[PDB]
Design a protein around this ligand. Structure first.
Ligand code: ACP
Ligand code: ACP
Ligand code: MG
Ligand code: MG
Lengths: 280, 280
């Protein structure tokens, strides 16, 4: 059970000297969904860019399938086929073409025939509800529409690992729920997911494991439920628990539960508890 | 007349023909905080770009202080000084220079002294905890840091009206709380706020009024608590009440809230009410 991806002791400063990763290590079990959380500037984006080989560290290394990645053209090509990335700014990921052309580029560049590439593209467009935008120039789109196009282009590649940098920023509710359904489906099909987010509710909905970043290091890592219900540890990266868990931890302290009972984590669970409560 | 801004019957299609605003009317009372919500592509950004005179409609008009604006160079300059806009994409708003210089340009272009400009810059940077980035090149920043710099540049100009296009996208929790504090202070000083967002919790925390956009038109507008608790109307733009408000409504359903008090509209407010609950 070697992880599919492992960051080992990554240290990276940008040209110009700004330090971004400081001895960062993080292992990603195959088939898991890993949420990465932490403050602006903690190094989440830079870490994702190391995991698909966009950036190379000054020290440390990334392992893919248990082996050090290698830095050749064939190496990097194989690496990027296996590990896809949806950038934080979707506009940076788009080409000056129509939506269909944009999403087609990847599968075609994979040396796929016209037919298998076509099927990939059509399914990706449908999965993100942008089929009707196929002939739209990518610049003639709203921010949330652009986000869908960028995600569709990545998913059309069917990578072994999908990295997403703040995938739901700017998405409307319908789009967020549709993306959740898609990502759950891809995971069920065996895909590994790593996503940065400031949405702790998204982490709660999608992650098996959670890593908290601060100042270029992993401050804490564990199963999603254990980390997301830990008020003191989350506070060290200036986060609160997901709202229902937040309140429900408060309820447990206040003596509203049992005691002996499990913590309500859903709206439904909390609603059921409320019927046994009154005002003082 | 009385509202500080009024969109009257705005119709706009982009070059190339994509329709964006469809006979849209929206009035903004001076001093209010207005949230604009609605699906990706609904026309939220396009409307904001009409309100500060960036885009000119094919039909309809914008009134500023009850007066039709006009489109001369000097009309536009005066309009933009009175109505600032934080763009949806921070990179579109940042100059290729240091953070301090970027934020200083607005005040300096207003004809203020270097001493006044300096004070405005330092106040804006400190409000969003980025004083220590003053000499950082704006490209050498994370997405959330860039968001803070763009907001700082707009608030340093101290406009009559501040428009914010999805200002918390990519922002961490601390940044969001600091933005709320900043915006509350600016409004107390008399500033009018209009913000587009997909974060309905932000709307709950910050808005006096909420407008719901659908396919280029205002579907509904009203007092924030009324709109954000209106399950039926929210469903028409594929929204639900914010989780805090859902839980507050749920609490009221079980009589756990103030006979007649306004709903808790923030996590802290909901948590406070919890202190007064006991088991049956
Ligand atoms: N530069 C551009 N050229 C052409 N059409 C554009 C455009 N920018 C946006 N559009 C189109 O104009 C309409 C309104 O887009 P707008 O960006 O105002 O929506 P919005 O701000 O509500 C969406 P989002 O929440 O996704 O940011 C949509 O149909 C969109 O595809
Ligand atoms: N292109 C660039 N050049 C130089 N420094 C950069 C940079 N992009 C980011 N940085 C810096 O690198 C560090 C890590 O930033 P990174 O963008 O990886 O973090 P992050 O993704 O956790 C933040 P966010 O939540 O704001 O998107 C910060 O100190 C940031 O200012
Ligand atoms: Mg980032
Ligand atoms: Mg927009």
């Amino acid at each position: 059970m070697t992880p599919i991806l492992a960051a080992e002791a990554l240290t990276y400063a940008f040209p110009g000297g700004v330090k971004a990763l400081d001895d960062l290590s993080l292992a990603v079990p195959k088939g898991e969904s890993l949420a990465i959380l932490g403050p602006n500037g903690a190094g989440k984006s830079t870490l994702l860019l190391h995991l698909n080989g966009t950036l190379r560290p000054q020290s440390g290394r990334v392992l893919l399938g248990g082996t050090a990645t290698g830095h050749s053209r064939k190496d990097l090509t194989g690496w990027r086929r296996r590990v896809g990335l949806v950038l934080q700014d979707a506009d940076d990921q788009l080409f000056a073409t129509t939506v269909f052309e944009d999403v087609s580029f990847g599968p075609l560049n994979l040396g796929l025939s016209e037919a298998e590439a076509r099927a990939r593209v059509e399914e990706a467009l449908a999965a993100l509800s942008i089929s009707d935008l196929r002939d739209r120039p990518t610049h003639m789109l709203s921010g949330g529409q652009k986000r869908r196009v960028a995600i569709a282009g990545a998913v059309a590649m069917r990578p072994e690992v999908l990295l997403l940098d703040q995938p739901t920023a700017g998405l409307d509710l319908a789009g967020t729920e549709q993306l959740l359904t898609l990502l759950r489906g891809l995971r069920a099909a065996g895909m590994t997911l790593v996503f940065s987010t400031h949405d702790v509710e998204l982490a709660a909905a999608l992650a098996d494991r959670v890593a908290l970043f601060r100042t270029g290091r992993v401050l804490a890592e564990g199963a999603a439920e254990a980390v997301l219900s830990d008020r003191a540890t989350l506070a060290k990266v200036a986060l609160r628990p997901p709202l229902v868990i937040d309140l429900a931890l408060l309820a447990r302290d206040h003596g509203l539960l049992a005691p002996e009972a499990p913590l309500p984590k859903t709206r439904d669970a909390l609603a059921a508890q409320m019927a046994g409560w009154t005002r003082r």
